[PDB]
Amino acid sequence: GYDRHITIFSPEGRLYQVEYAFKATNQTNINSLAVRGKDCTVVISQKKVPDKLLDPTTVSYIFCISRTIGMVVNGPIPDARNAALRAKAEAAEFRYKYGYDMPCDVLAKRMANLSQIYTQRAYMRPLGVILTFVSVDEELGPSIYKTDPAGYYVGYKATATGPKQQEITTNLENHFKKSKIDHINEESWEKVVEFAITHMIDALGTEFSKNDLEVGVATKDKFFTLSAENIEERLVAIAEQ
Amino acid sequence: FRNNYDGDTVTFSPTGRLFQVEYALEAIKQGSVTVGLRSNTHAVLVALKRNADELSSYQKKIIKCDEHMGLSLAGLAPDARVLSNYLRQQCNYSSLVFNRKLAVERAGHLLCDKAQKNTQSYGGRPYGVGLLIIGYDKSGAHLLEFQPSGNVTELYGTAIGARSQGAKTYLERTLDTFIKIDGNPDELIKAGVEAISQSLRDESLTVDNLSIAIVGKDTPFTIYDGEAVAKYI
Amino acid sequence: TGYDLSNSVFSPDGRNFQVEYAVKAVENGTTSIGIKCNDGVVFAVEKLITSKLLVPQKNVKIQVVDRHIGCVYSGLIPDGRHLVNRGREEAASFKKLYKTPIPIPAFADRLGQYVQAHTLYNSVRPFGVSTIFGGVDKNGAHLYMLEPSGSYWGYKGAATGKGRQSAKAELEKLVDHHPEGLSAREAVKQAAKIIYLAHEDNKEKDFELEISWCSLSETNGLHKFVKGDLLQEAIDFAQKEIN
Amino acid sequence: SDPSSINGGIVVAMTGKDCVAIACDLRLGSQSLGVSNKFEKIFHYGHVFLGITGLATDVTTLNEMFRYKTNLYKLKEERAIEPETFTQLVSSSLYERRFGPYFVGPVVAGINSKSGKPFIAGFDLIGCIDEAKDFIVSGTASDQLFGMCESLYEPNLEPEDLFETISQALLNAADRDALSGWGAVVYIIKKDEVVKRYLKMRQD
Amino acid sequence: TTIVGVKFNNGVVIAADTRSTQGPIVADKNCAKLHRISPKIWCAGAGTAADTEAVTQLIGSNIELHSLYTSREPRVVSALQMLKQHLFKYQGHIGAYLIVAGVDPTGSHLFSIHAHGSTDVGYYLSLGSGSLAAMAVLESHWKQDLTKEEAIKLASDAIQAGIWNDLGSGSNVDVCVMEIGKDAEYLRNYLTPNVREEKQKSYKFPRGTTAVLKESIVNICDIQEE
Amino acid sequence: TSIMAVTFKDGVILGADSRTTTGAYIANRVTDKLTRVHDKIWCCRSGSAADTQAIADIVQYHLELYTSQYGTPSTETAASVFKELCYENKDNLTAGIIVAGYDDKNKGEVYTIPLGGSVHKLPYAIAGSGSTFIYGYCDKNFRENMSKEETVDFIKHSLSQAIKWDGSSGGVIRMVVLTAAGVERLIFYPDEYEQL
Amino acid sequence: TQQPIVTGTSVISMKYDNGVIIAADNLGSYGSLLRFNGVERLIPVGDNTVVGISGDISDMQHIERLLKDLVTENAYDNPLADAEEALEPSYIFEYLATVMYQRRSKMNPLWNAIIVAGVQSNGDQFLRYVNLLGVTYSSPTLATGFGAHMANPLLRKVVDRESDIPKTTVQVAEEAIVNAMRVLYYRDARSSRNFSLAIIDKNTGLTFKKNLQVENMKWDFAKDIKGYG
Amino acid sequence: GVRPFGVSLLIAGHDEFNGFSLYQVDPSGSYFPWKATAIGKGSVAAKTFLEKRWNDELELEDAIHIALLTLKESVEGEFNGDTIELAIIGDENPDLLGYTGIPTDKGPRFRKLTSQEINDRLEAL
């Protein structure tokens, strides 16, 4: 239908185009996880291990946008890259404009506004990726802001994304009620990573190797990716179950 | 497949072959026949000068582009024009700024590109005209074919337009003979006449219709007609 | 569907129908391979000889870029040649400004954004070539391949065109024999055999083998075509074992 | 001679009790040649009064300019022009030519219609917003006028007293100026009505 | 023009004189020089008067825009940055030179900004033409970690040295104390040297001293529909 | 105004004074001019403070983008981006910028960008008012791959003579030590080195 | 409008029978202050050309970078090229001249005086001059600035005309350049003791002799005089 | 080629000249003042309730209790002050002026009422 194609309001008044973007962002099947520790923000994504024709390490879904701010991407790769530019770019420009490091909350707001402009542009087809910013924010400390392809955005205590998102959510919900707070337990940055690794394994039911994950960790003034072998230190106690 | 997909340059068939491209080729088949060939030291183009009627003058289809350059057309007349003036422009820029004559090969890469821009674009015309370009640079004689696709190919000898069958066969046979022949303008020019007779249904052999161009390491780009082509006819 | 009759509409597929078609065209191009070695890369390509009237090694498919980036491409010849030319212009700006040769992943990114825009818009027809590129920059040797999708990744082997299937199988030996990659001189010989067995799938026309390399130990980390005696020798190795 | 002082002219305003006054002389000269004995330069937009000193062609220009802008104000917002908003409006325009400023001295006088609050404000070439409520002076002979206004004026003047005070201030400066001397007009502006008085004074 | 800035422990205090001059004539007896970029970012302006008000108004809006956009009180440095670029473009013809002060969630700051585009940080700064006079007190008495109370004396006394030596410094001293976690305490007319004094003699004129040649009554009032 | 950088074995040490005068008046005696453009590429500013300050912010943001997309800038890369803006605008903007930064592979690198605007790698670099005064003293005393403590001392020895000869040089000798350790501040009062 | 800030100095050069010789000392002066005492002013492009650039160092690097790109541009399209349409001293030369005059027309030149020396594909010797206003000439002997007046006259004693070119051997030419540079060090202050030498010979390619020193300083006349005393 | 704003507003506000004021702005770009209006699914329900219980001449304090009840028809599963955002534009707050010591500047007219504050207003219903 022509009704499917028009960028301008659909007869329903809720776009077909928007529902479509939502389809897209589950083609790759990346289950990702982001939680807020006490003073640490853990992001984990499946690192696929393809054939030898590609290097496995190089393949990634976790990207360092700026200092403190990391981004996990869910949905197709070429569109991921397109989006990525604009966010890296603005963090720099804000620092020039305003002479201080950009806060997390403000970067997400900018990108919702760009998303909406896309459906007002006739030529342009709306980007069909999930941008979830994680950081140790300047004021607010651990912060999670998940951004939708449509352009809806909302903050999170914890979240997962994927087609199998549903299973992970339940564990995280019940956990937080027993713990009676919103932060994953232990001040220590190291053991919170391990509580995240473990909870990913449970929900999905599949044990993942160091090969099958990538672990990005937020501290004060850096976002950085751990070594392959760091992951293993956690994994080993857990792996016998 | 009129309209729908493959009806505009942007829209793909599922396979991804533009039907329009083949049509642009058809324009060349409808086009005036021309046979081009070379040797290391000379490049010789022979083209039949088409005419409407007796009183209409036999019209040149070989166009001198530059002193050391020239081209011949087979296909759509408006397109050839926009392209030809551009050939001239580029050659002038290099001579002025960078000293050098524009090399024949390197001019072709640009020409390719120009054709592809119209294929990227909404609207515009992919050029629907094929051009045999001959030239004398510091790499000596060359002969290119420019396709409506864009592709430029260095060939010993080729022919485009109407009934290409007879001259192509003829060239394959005499391939070895004209490539060894160098240092002989007059003999290359003979080979080329003999070649165009095969293609034609003997429409004319008149001095009046055949126009022969030659550029090489010896002769500059000179257009030969009447008496000068009566030697070899 | 009407998504094939209007570019850059979000399909319920999630990828526009036209862009998909564009990929398919890569296959109609020639077996082109690339081999990542231990101190450089090799590019190798099957160039079908159309006729006796074609002229040896003059319309070579291998194209030089920068002075350290070796480039070859499969699919629409016109589309790719413009893309390679676009690529130099980008590299050019990079050199003036930052006074330094482009890193190979920098080069991939820049090209990546260019493709992306030209598919996200109705106005500009999707690109329909896959490009094998890389060489020896500052961070040493890399082999990358750029999908017309606009994904790119690092690789240790690349193979594309029709006869990629043959090619991938022969590339698996390389990794097992050496995680490093094979020695750059010895890999010239392996590369010829790969192109030649994959010309048994594209035998219907004649072919010419064209190899190039950018290798720190045998090229000083500048780009060069392998020609002459190394090239003629390579053909023999291949001919001998497929007998 | 800078373009403002070719044409000079003077404006002097004072607040009184539940009233303001805005007053000027009527001499228009260009250099040695005096051009018209009678010439006005105090205009009113609603109950808000603006006299304007300085270069005559720029006076005319700005008067049109403001008449244009203030029309829109009363139509769109569906309320009379106040002095408070009007002070900002004069200021905004003046600043847009920073480089090569309008060669004028505008003076606002009017009463806020929401509390009877007497309001005067002044301006120079460059858009300064002067908040003196005692008095405001402007022109070439501004300096002279200030000196009158500072001795004669007293806080709290009855309307009929304020009328005498301002008149003597305007008059004596006039005769110690070159580019003034010919006639005078005083606007005494009250919330209920305006009385406008052409005085009798010495003439060259 | 004498303007001071003094950091104290739990905030900062900015002060400047109210007296305004246009040439050697006193334009305004009082008119405060302390302008509001935002509720807890105040600055006091020196230079060309017109430019100082205008730039504060134009920039003001963008800062206000920022605040609401971000749902967060902008940084003191954010105002600093935005201010600096504006001036820099015109290479200082726009001649606003300002002491930028404020408190924010990050902490307390005191900077100076010049029209050319140069910045500094100071514990204690002075600006205007009376910078020379005010500083001298400051440098002779200031110690590390002055109390709020002590900052306020040192500060006011310093403005007095400006007053008496610089002609353009004068009348009431106005002070705005911005403290962490609290609404700025604008201390209007902290200091008063002396004020206008009534003239010895009366300058009341009996009515009929002014002569009235003609009269025309204007009706700005609404003519009847009838 | 006197600024300097001197290479040594283990990296480079950036030094500056901090006294900036407007006319005869000392406008600020504790002026900061070691400005971080990158984690271990810092710059030293002299000339017009207004102009160098603007320049340094523009470069800064540029190197952040370069880090994210193209990978980490080296000291050379930075020197070019400083150069290009300085060159086209050689006349409008006055700039004496020393771009120095520390790679573990190449130890300390020092590149001086004069007013004219050109890249010149030097084992050591001097600029500002005070450099004329010490030009020969430093050449006499230059020593390549010296100890880290000797490097501290040298900066101190040379600058004390700059203060004597130039009364606009002076205030705290601040330092940014770039070695692989990280980034370390040293601060040395006048009181120490002037009497030394 | 570009005005000189950082400065350069004289370049001497000559034709001989089988090639050409260009030489220049290695200085990047900032006026009276000899700030940089080893900034190499001879920039080879391939073995084919060595382009001597005097005047501002800032613009020496601007052009240096243009040439770096120009090599790459040439190598794009028909890369089996190596001596055909591949760069010649004349190719290079023509490019610089055209840019230069356009820069002068915007009343803001690149402020340099330049001598292109090199050997054509024919083997013919090339020496052609171009400078900031855009004065173009070729001459058997060429020198700039201070060199023009002082090291040019000695060169002419040898290669007085066209016919003298063949008689001048690469050996005489070598003595000639080297001797001349000593004189310039003696009586010009700018000139340093260090100098570089480049020989483009059709047979031996590029022989680039760096960091040669001027010796045999004259103080034999210094000791004779004591003036008034 | 640019679709209408997907949203219709109420702009409620306070200014001096024309006192408290209440508006609707339509994505068409027509606007109208009202005595009372409500929008959304439950617009039918709400408007009639306001009519019955209230008129402008009644004080504000009564309306807040009324408005909660009205919205409470809409949904009864949760009405907790977390999920309900309630604000007033009314009197100035000279505290929230934020640069006290100057009184003449109007404080903020708007004051957003916290969840706790809502809960207080729920026990007054």
mmCIF file with all atom_site columns, N, CA, C and O in Angstrom, chain G residues 60-89:
data_model
loop_
_atom_site.group_PDB
_atom_site.id
_atom_site.type_symbol
_atom_site.label_atom_id
_atom_site.label_alt_id
_atom_site.label_comp_id
_atom_site.label_asym_id
_atom_site.label_entity_id
_atom_site.label_seq_id
_atom_site.pdbx_PDB_ins_code
_atom_site.Cartn_x
_atom_site.Cartn_y
_atom_site.Cartn_z
_atom_site.occupancy
_atom_site.B_iso_or_equiv
_atom_site.pdbx_formal_charge
_atom_site.auth_seq_id
_atom_site.auth_comp_id
_atom_site.auth_asym_id
_atom_site.auth_atom_id
_atom_site.pdbx_PDB_model_num
ATOM 1   N N  . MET G 1 60 ? 57.183 27.016 2.242   1.00 0.00 ? 60 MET G N  1
ATOM 2   C CA . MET G 1 60 ? 57.996 25.926 1.722   1.00 0.00 ? 60 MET G CA 1
ATOM 3   C C  . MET G 1 60 ? 57.245 24.701 2.039   1.00 0.00 ? 60 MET G C  1
ATOM 4   O O  . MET G 1 60 ? 57.042 23.867 1.185   1.00 0.00 ? 60 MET G O  1
ATOM 5   N N  . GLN G 1 61 ? 56.738 24.489 3.299   1.00 0.00 ? 61 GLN G N  1
ATOM 6   C CA . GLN G 1 61 ? 55.935 23.348 3.637   1.00 0.00 ? 61 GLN G CA 1
ATOM 7   C C  . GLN G 1 61 ? 54.593 23.321 2.967   1.00 0.00 ? 61 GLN G C  1
ATOM 8   O O  . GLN G 1 61 ? 54.063 22.220 2.773   1.00 0.00 ? 61 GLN G O  1
ATOM 9   N N  . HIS G 1 62 ? 53.966 24.490 2.652   1.00 0.00 ? 62 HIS G N  1
ATOM 10  C CA . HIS G 1 62 ? 52.706 24.453 1.944   1.00 0.00 ? 62 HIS G CA 1
ATOM 11  C C  . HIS G 1 62 ? 52.812 23.862 0.626   1.00 0.00 ? 62 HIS G C  1
ATOM 12  O O  . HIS G 1 62 ? 52.101 22.992 0.275   1.00 0.00 ? 62 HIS G O  1
ATOM 13  N N  . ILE G 1 63 ? 53.790 24.290 -0.139  1.00 0.00 ? 63 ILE G N  1
ATOM 14  C CA . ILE G 1 63 ? 54.058 23.736 -1.450  1.00 0.00 ? 63 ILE G CA 1
ATOM 15  C C  . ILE G 1 63 ? 54.529 22.285 -1.323  1.00 0.00 ? 63 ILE G C  1
ATOM 16  O O  . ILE G 1 63 ? 54.224 21.437 -2.210  1.00 0.00 ? 63 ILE G O  1
ATOM 17  N N  . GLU G 1 64 ? 55.365 21.912 -0.244  1.00 0.00 ? 64 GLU G N  1
ATOM 18  C CA . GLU G 1 64 ? 55.972 20.585 -0.068  1.00 0.00 ? 64 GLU G CA 1
ATOM 19  C C  . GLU G 1 64 ? 54.844 19.626 -0.080  1.00 0.00 ? 64 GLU G C  1
ATOM 20  O O  . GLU G 1 64 ? 54.965 18.578 -0.704  1.00 0.00 ? 64 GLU G O  1
ATOM 21  N N  . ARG G 1 65 ? 53.770 19.932 0.584   1.00 0.00 ? 65 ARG G N  1
ATOM 22  C CA . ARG G 1 65 ? 52.601 19.101 0.770   1.00 0.00 ? 65 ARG G CA 1
ATOM 23  C C  . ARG G 1 65 ? 51.817 18.990 -0.578  1.00 0.00 ? 65 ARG G C  1
ATOM 24  O O  . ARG G 1 65 ? 51.313 17.889 -0.804  1.00 0.00 ? 65 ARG G O  1
ATOM 25  N N  . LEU G 1 66 ? 51.693 20.039 -1.347  1.00 0.00 ? 66 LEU G N  1
ATOM 26  C CA . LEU G 1 66 ? 51.075 20.026 -2.636  1.00 0.00 ? 66 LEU G CA 1
ATOM 27  C C  . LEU G 1 66 ? 51.798 19.048 -3.519  1.00 0.00 ? 66 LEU G C  1
ATOM 28  O O  . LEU G 1 66 ? 51.100 18.266 -4.206  1.00 0.00 ? 66 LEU G O  1
ATOM 29  N N  . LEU G 1 67 ? 53.136 19.014 -3.522  1.00 0.00 ? 67 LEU G N  1
ATOM 30  C CA . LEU G 1 67 ? 53.929 18.105 -4.293  1.00 0.00 ? 67 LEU G CA 1
ATOM 31  C C  . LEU G 1 67 ? 53.748 16.660 -3.907  1.00 0.00 ? 67 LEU G C  1
ATOM 32  O O  . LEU G 1 67 ? 53.687 15.750 -4.733  1.00 0.00 ? 67 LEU G O  1
ATOM 33  N N  . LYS G 1 68 ? 53.584 16.372 -2.577  1.00 0.00 ? 68 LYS G N  1
ATOM 34  C CA . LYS G 1 68 ? 53.382 15.051 -2.038  1.00 0.00 ? 68 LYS G CA 1
ATOM 35  C C  . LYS G 1 68 ? 52.117 14.397 -2.622  1.00 0.00 ? 68 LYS G C  1
ATOM 36  O O  . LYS G 1 68 ? 52.093 13.266 -3.133  1.00 0.00 ? 68 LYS G O  1
ATOM 37  N N  . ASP G 1 69 ? 51.012 15.181 -2.650  1.00 0.00 ? 69 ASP G N  1
ATOM 38  C CA . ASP G 1 69 ? 49.739 14.866 -3.288  1.00 0.00 ? 69 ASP G CA 1
ATOM 39  C C  . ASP G 1 69 ? 49.850 14.669 -4.788  1.00 0.00 ? 69 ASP G C  1
ATOM 40  O O  . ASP G 1 69 ? 49.212 13.755 -5.353  1.00 0.00 ? 69 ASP G O  1
ATOM 41  N N  . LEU G 1 70 ? 50.764 15.483 -5.402  1.00 0.00 ? 70 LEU G N  1
ATOM 42  C CA . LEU G 1 70 ? 50.871 15.543 -6.875  1.00 0.00 ? 70 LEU G CA 1
ATOM 43  C C  . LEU G 1 70 ? 51.436 14.262 -7.464  1.00 0.00 ? 70 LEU G C  1
ATOM 44  O O  . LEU G 1 70 ? 50.987 13.799 -8.492  1.00 0.00 ? 70 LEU G O  1
ATOM 45  N N  . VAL G 1 71 ? 52.284 13.570 -6.692  1.00 0.00 ? 71 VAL G N  1
ATOM 46  C CA . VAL G 1 71 ? 52.925 12.337 -6.956  1.00 0.00 ? 71 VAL G CA 1
ATOM 47  C C  . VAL G 1 71 ? 51.910 11.211 -7.003  1.00 0.00 ? 71 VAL G C  1
ATOM 48  O O  . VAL G 1 71 ? 51.861 10.468 -7.970  1.00 0.00 ? 71 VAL G O  1
ATOM 49  N N  . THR G 1 72 ? 51.028 11.144 -5.893  1.00 0.00 ? 72 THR G N  1
ATOM 50  C CA . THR G 1 72 ? 49.887 10.299 -5.789  1.00 0.00 ? 72 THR G CA 1
ATOM 51  C C  . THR G 1 72 ? 48.937 10.488 -6.891  1.00 0.00 ? 72 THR G C  1
ATOM 52  O O  . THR G 1 72 ? 48.606 9.450  -7.452  1.00 0.00 ? 72 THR G O  1
ATOM 53  N N  . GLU G 1 73 ? 48.590 11.778 -7.337  1.00 0.00 ? 73 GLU G N  1
ATOM 54  C CA . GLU G 1 73 ? 47.598 12.095 -8.369  1.00 0.00 ? 73 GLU G CA 1
ATOM 55  C C  . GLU G 1 73 ? 48.057 11.511 -9.694  1.00 0.00 ? 73 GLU G C  1
ATOM 56  O O  . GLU G 1 73 ? 47.309 10.972 -10.515 1.00 0.00 ? 73 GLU G O  1
ATOM 57  N N  . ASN G 1 74 ? 49.351 11.634 -10.013 1.00 0.00 ? 74 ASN G N  1
ATOM 58  C CA . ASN G 1 74 ? 50.004 11.195 -11.209 1.00 0.00 ? 74 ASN G CA 1
ATOM 59  C C  . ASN G 1 74 ? 49.910 9.681  -11.276 1.00 0.00 ? 74 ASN G C  1
ATOM 60  O O  . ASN G 1 74 ? 49.688 9.236  -12.377 1.00 0.00 ? 74 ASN G O  1
ATOM 61  N N  . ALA G 1 75 ? 50.083 8.950  -10.189 1.00 0.00 ? 75 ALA G N  1
ATOM 62  C CA . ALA G 1 75 ? 50.087 7.563  -10.060 1.00 0.00 ? 75 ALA G CA 1
ATOM 63  C C  . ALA G 1 75 ? 48.730 6.980  -10.145 1.00 0.00 ? 75 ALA G C  1
ATOM 64  O O  . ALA G 1 75 ? 48.570 5.836  -10.656 1.00 0.00 ? 75 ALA G O  1
ATOM 65  N N  . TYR G 1 76 ? 47.670 7.820  -9.934  1.00 0.00 ? 76 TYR G N  1
ATOM 66  C CA . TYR G 1 76 ? 46.294 7.411  -10.154 1.00 0.00 ? 76 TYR G CA 1
ATOM 67  C C  . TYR G 1 76 ? 46.046 7.445  -11.617 1.00 0.00 ? 76 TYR G C  1
ATOM 68  O O  . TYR G 1 76 ? 46.402 8.444  -12.245 1.00 0.00 ? 76 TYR G O  1
ATOM 69  N N  . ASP G 1 77 ? 45.412 6.379  -12.157 1.00 0.00 ? 77 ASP G N  1
ATOM 70  C CA . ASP G 1 77 ? 45.101 6.270  -13.599 1.00 0.00 ? 77 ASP G CA 1
ATOM 71  C C  . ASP G 1 77 ? 46.261 6.101  -14.556 1.00 0.00 ? 77 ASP G C  1
ATOM 72  O O  . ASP G 1 77 ? 47.116 6.996  -14.746 1.00 0.00 ? 77 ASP G O  1
ATOM 73  N N  . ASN G 1 78 ? 46.264 4.880  -15.199 1.00 0.00 ? 78 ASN G N  1
ATOM 74  C CA . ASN G 1 78 ? 47.460 4.431  -15.930 1.00 0.00 ? 78 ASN G CA 1
ATOM 75  C C  . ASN G 1 78 ? 48.723 4.388  -15.105 1.00 0.00 ? 78 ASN G C  1
ATOM 76  O O  . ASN G 1 78 ? 49.721 5.112  -15.240 1.00 0.00 ? 78 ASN G O  1
ATOM 77  N N  . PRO G 1 79 ? 48.707 3.452  -14.068 1.00 0.00 ? 79 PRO G N  1
ATOM 78  C CA . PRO G 1 79 ? 49.844 3.355  -13.191 1.00 0.00 ? 79 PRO G CA 1
ATOM 79  C C  . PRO G 1 79 ? 50.978 2.580  -13.822 1.00 0.00 ? 79 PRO G C  1
ATOM 80  O O  . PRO G 1 79 ? 52.076 2.560  -13.183 1.00 0.00 ? 79 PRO G O  1
ATOM 81  N N  . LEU G 1 80 ? 50.858 1.919  -14.959 1.00 0.00 ? 80 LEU G N  1
ATOM 82  C CA . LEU G 1 80 ? 52.066 1.274  -15.588 1.00 0.00 ? 80 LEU G CA 1
ATOM 83  C C  . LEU G 1 80 ? 52.994 2.411  -16.114 1.00 0.00 ? 80 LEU G C  1
ATOM 84  O O  . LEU G 1 80 ? 54.104 2.080  -16.499 1.00 0.00 ? 80 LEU G O  1
ATOM 85  N N  . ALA G 1 81 ? 52.518 3.722  -16.175 1.00 0.00 ? 81 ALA G N  1
ATOM 86  C CA . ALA G 1 81 ? 53.282 4.880  -16.341 1.00 0.00 ? 81 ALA G CA 1
ATOM 87  C C  . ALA G 1 81 ? 54.523 4.917  -15.536 1.00 0.00 ? 81 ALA G C  1
ATOM 88  O O  . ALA G 1 81 ? 54.444 4.670  -14.355 1.00 0.00 ? 81 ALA G O  1
ATOM 89  N N  . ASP G 1 82 ? 55.676 5.309  -16.040 1.00 0.00 ? 82 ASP G N  1
ATOM 90  C CA . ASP G 1 82 ? 56.877 5.566  -15.322 1.00 0.00 ? 82 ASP G CA 1
ATOM 91  C C  . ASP G 1 82 ? 57.796 6.564  -15.939 1.00 0.00 ? 82 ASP G C  1
ATOM 92  O O  . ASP G 1 82 ? 58.764 6.862  -15.262 1.00 0.00 ? 82 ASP G O  1
ATOM 93  N N  . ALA G 1 83 ? 57.534 7.015  -17.188 1.00 0.00 ? 83 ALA G N  1
ATOM 94  C CA . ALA G 1 83 ? 58.419 7.885  -17.849 1.00 0.00 ? 83 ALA G CA 1
ATOM 95  C C  . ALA G 1 83 ? 57.712 8.536  -19.025 1.00 0.00 ? 83 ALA G C  1
ATOM 96  O O  . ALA G 1 83 ? 58.246 9.410  -19.757 1.00 0.00 ? 83 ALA G O  1
ATOM 97  N N  . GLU G 1 84 ? 56.422 8.193  -19.166 1.00 0.00 ? 84 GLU G N  1
ATOM 98  C CA . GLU G 1 84 ? 55.611 8.667  -20.216 1.00 0.00 ? 84 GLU G CA 1
ATOM 99  C C  . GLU G 1 84 ? 55.038 9.962  -19.729 1.00 0.00 ? 84 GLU G C  1
ATOM 100 O O  . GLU G 1 84 ? 55.697 11.019 -19.661 1.00 0.00 ? 84 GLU G O  1
ATOM 101 N N  . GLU G 1 85 ? 53.782 9.864  -19.347 1.00 0.00 ? 85 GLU G N  1
ATOM 102 C CA . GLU G 1 85 ? 53.115 11.002 -18.854 1.00 0.00 ? 85 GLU G CA 1
ATOM 103 C C  . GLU G 1 85 ? 53.472 11.250 -17.394 1.00 0.00 ? 85 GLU G C  1
ATOM 104 O O  . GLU G 1 85 ? 52.819 12.118 -16.859 1.00 0.00 ? 85 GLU G O  1
ATOM 105 N N  . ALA G 1 86 ? 54.321 10.380 -16.870 1.00 0.00 ? 86 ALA G N  1
ATOM 106 C CA . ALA G 1 86 ? 54.784 10.487 -15.526 1.00 0.00 ? 86 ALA G CA 1
ATOM 107 C C  . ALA G 1 86 ? 55.509 11.828 -15.518 1.00 0.00 ? 86 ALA G C  1
ATOM 108 O O  . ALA G 1 86 ? 56.181 12.255 -16.495 1.00 0.00 ? 86 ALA G O  1
ATOM 109 N N  . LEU G 1 87 ? 55.495 12.565 -14.339 1.00 0.00 ? 87 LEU G N  1
ATOM 110 C CA . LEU G 1 87 ? 56.161 13.830 -14.075 1.00 0.00 ? 87 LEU G CA 1
ATOM 111 C C  . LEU G 1 87 ? 57.528 14.029 -14.709 1.00 0.00 ? 87 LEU G C  1
ATOM 112 O O  . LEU G 1 87 ? 58.395 13.171 -14.749 1.00 0.00 ? 87 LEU G O  1
ATOM 113 N N  . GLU G 1 88 ? 57.773 15.281 -15.100 1.00 0.00 ? 88 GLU G N  1
ATOM 114 C CA . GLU G 1 88 ? 58.958 15.845 -15.713 1.00 0.00 ? 88 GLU G CA 1
ATOM 115 C C  . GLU G 1 88 ? 59.199 17.127 -14.846 1.00 0.00 ? 88 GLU G C  1
ATOM 116 O O  . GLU G 1 88 ? 58.216 17.548 -14.200 1.00 0.00 ? 88 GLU G O  1
ATOM 117 N N  . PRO G 1 89 ? 60.385 17.750 -14.806 1.00 0.00 ? 89 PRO G N  1
ATOM 118 C CA . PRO G 1 89 ? 60.597 19.012 -14.254 1.00 0.00 ? 89 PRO G CA 1
ATOM 119 C C  . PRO G 1 89 ? 59.672 20.019 -14.842 1.00 0.00 ? 89 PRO G C  1
ATOM 120 O O  . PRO G 1 89 ? 59.286 20.936 -14.138 1.00 0.00 ? 89 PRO G O  1
#
